């Protein structure tokens, strides 16, 4: 029960580093590079995957 | 007239020459948004006893989240503690009984804010009673709240029932 | 310039085995009491490396392809390794890189270099007054069109010859990623006979050169001495290797240093460790 | 009657923190114009400046320049921009000849001595040398190419 | 430079559409009319501004743009420039410079 929970928590957290098709996993990075209309396209991929 | 002509040319080679820096004052033991070199984030800067490798500036945990950073200027070990956060719990009796309400915080002491502290977090708007009675409103850490006696909300330890020998 | 050494003898490139060699810190990220998995250009464990040596009737300064990256290991006494020659055509037709140590500072420049068939540095008249001072420069005849220059901090290098076991060991890693040359260095004493000793060492960052040029080949500079085709070489051995994109499991201790490395592809056993992300296979 | 969680409280950052390394190990730009002697308009030396940090606020706010102008880049934006190679030209020209220095210019000094390409992104700096170069009797050390 | 999300000397100074703007942009060549001799001063624009203008906003302030520390006092000078400017219009201008 402890191991199954640790894997679920560890897994859930490590997914934040995944790109999920986006250019980068960091939100401020996309907002600090692409234009407002271009960023939303990439931010949606992160929100969708997450 | 002595003329100095500076030719600025950006080639495919990497860039080196850059403008000046800032390096403002540092703050610790407070919630702030810090940006160190090419790293940014929000957390509480606190000096710990850990020792980073001289050639490794930034650390990371098992989750790949940096828990501490080294000052790009001064040499120090500063642990990064996330800002205080938690869920907002409202313990109040039914509308039929009374409108009294008691706010409860989880996993945090009393900061924002009859301000009392419990094992589950900060509890405001309630009174601590030593007499243990039957549980009414579950809270946590073996503590239950109820509305009793000029009546208000009190916080007492959950009782396991009458003693029988 | 166009003269070749008379004492230099050609020999076949004998091969030897390396144990853990080729492990290094991938980045500056600090981690402790954790096991990390990453993929990058590495030297596979239990792989085969190349065996070269220099001595007063065989001398080896062959050309070798750089490809993506290479691993270098040499056991030294007098620090016979003078540097390396990096370049595409190895001529003035392009920009070539030279990492050289003059015993005072480390000179690193990118210019248009005139290439010599057999570059080296001679040292004359040891006898009494042990000398050991650079005199002739066969590295390049001339240089121009310099887009880069670098000089390290002053230091005193001891070129005096020694006897018995080799007292110096230098293992470096050379690679090019996104036009950034990465150099990782480690120095520890060892007791060795031949081939390589069995052990583990973690290389550390030395310098970072944002030169951004393509290197298809390289050479290993060596120092010659005699009491310019008649010079002789001292007894030494150096090695070269090719890096491959292999995944290792780097075990970090409480202090942050790497205790041991495990190659995901070695035998069916190691593959189980990267499958479980742990060094203990139940 | 019961306990209900209506939201999740989060502490917002009070202020922003900024930290970086020192400014040490710069390129001595002040010594370029501070040099005792400068090359002739035809002899102008080309200095290659790289691998350092550049502070342009001291040159603009020092009021030590007679005329300062840039082409393609603003002076306030130079501090926020990183450049791979910076070439600082040095030479001495007549006062009326300074107007011929610019992208796509003409004249004797521009065509036959020194010319600026149309895409030149650099800047120009000049100040009166009459208190140093010019001396009693005349100084012929600084020459120019009249014909080409 | 007039469009949702686009930036430039128009969107960042005088006229800016919002990123969510829904509409139709129409344009046609008036060069045979609007162009008068050397220029038409009836159509001006804000060349310099101290910040970025928000969409759906009209700022008529003519205050002198001051990039330096010297007070402009409402007149041109060092680090003092008159922001309002006029589009040059001529019948011989190229398609890029035509109104």
Residue numbers in the entry:
A (entry chain A): 951 to 1000
B (entry chain D): 508 to 620, 641 to 676, 689 to 704
C (entry chain A): 14 to 69, 77 to 247, 255 to 309
D (entry chain D): 310 to 457
E (entry chain B): 409 to 507
From the paper:
The spike (S) glycoprotein of SARS-CoV-2 mediates receptor recognition and viral entry into cells. It forms homotrimers protruding from the virus surface and, once engaged with the host-cell receptor–human ACE2, undergoes a substantial structural rearrangement to fuse the viral membrane with the host-cell membrane. The S protein is also the primary target of the humoral immune response during infection. A large number of SARS-CoV-2 neutralizing monoclonal antibodies bind S protein, especially its receptor-binding domain (RBD), providing a basis for vaccine development.
